[PDB]
Design a protein around this ligand. Sequence first.
Ligand SMILES: COc1ccc(F)c(C[C@@H]2CCc3c(C(C)C)nc(N)n3C2)c1
Length: 355
Amino acid sequence: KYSFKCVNSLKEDHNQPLFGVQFNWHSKEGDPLVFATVGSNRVTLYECHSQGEIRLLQSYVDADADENFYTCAWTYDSNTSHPLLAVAGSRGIIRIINPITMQCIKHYVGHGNAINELKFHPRDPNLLLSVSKDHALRLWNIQTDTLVAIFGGVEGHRDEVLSADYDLLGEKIMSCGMDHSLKLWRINSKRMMNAIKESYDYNPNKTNRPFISQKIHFPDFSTRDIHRNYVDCVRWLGDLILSKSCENAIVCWKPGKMEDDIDKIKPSESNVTILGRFDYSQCDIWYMRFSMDFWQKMLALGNQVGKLYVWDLEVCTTLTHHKCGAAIRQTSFSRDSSILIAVCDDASIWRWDRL
Ligand SMILES: COc1ccc(F)c(C[C@@H]2CCc3c(C(C)C)nc(N)n3C2)c1
């Protein structure tokens, strides 16, 4: 059903892989569609214009040349509506950047180990989730600069956490990593809702107390039975999960037996139910993300030879350009799903417009 035309492409002059791309879904009405790209020590902003024009807006060039940005996530200021961009990578430093000036206005350091993904809470623009090479997830309140919670320990991830996703309402997180496992962490518990509330009440200039972070050691569910390799991308599709490894499939599955409710699932739940698989080829290298559009009506995944697969989630289109031959690391749909951006290993950017 869905068709796209390649209207433009470009290459960033650093020639390093671009690991992340995100459209700003908080962009204002009347303003051009903006997306950010991340790779090497750079964060770059582009505007989408008519006649397929991809206009370079601005760039952040990190002071440390050895920084490798792996992820970016947009949010907005809850009082003014002004957009902000969160970036992080190999250095383990979260940077909150003002996109108008490219000023780093806030930075956070957990233990300083590489951050593989950032995600903002779907209902709270101040709640930032980070997943790290150090096997833990961290939840930050960027309004009060507090570490709300650390998810991990011997019962948490036993290797790098590579991806995570909040559900629709931001009541729970599903995480995944190098340990082959997918873990559930409920954040609508009395303990977590209280912690989030206290994070808002914290002001270090009016007290001598440190802000106490929750140490969440036990996940609400765990499975190692979906994939047989590094699980590098996870996303909620309602109460269901979409996840992939490097085994040439995106698996749609759920914790428990076929008719088990996600909110009745106990931590000891030993079963999983696979609902289906999105099969494809030549996407067996590690660290390849899939994306969905805002409405979760489309699913897109680039492969390691520059093909871009798009599935209709309501019922497969293959987007290919004879000059697009590098690994597509991540894709991003604009909020209205009219544009799909693919970023590559060779620092190239490809613009596909929906017909
Ligand atoms: C684009 O798709 C991603 C999926 C998952 C994911 F974690 C990332 C970010 C990094 C990409 C690079 C990286 C390495 C290098 C040193 C070999 N090693 C780890 N662990 N990474 C992860 C990206």
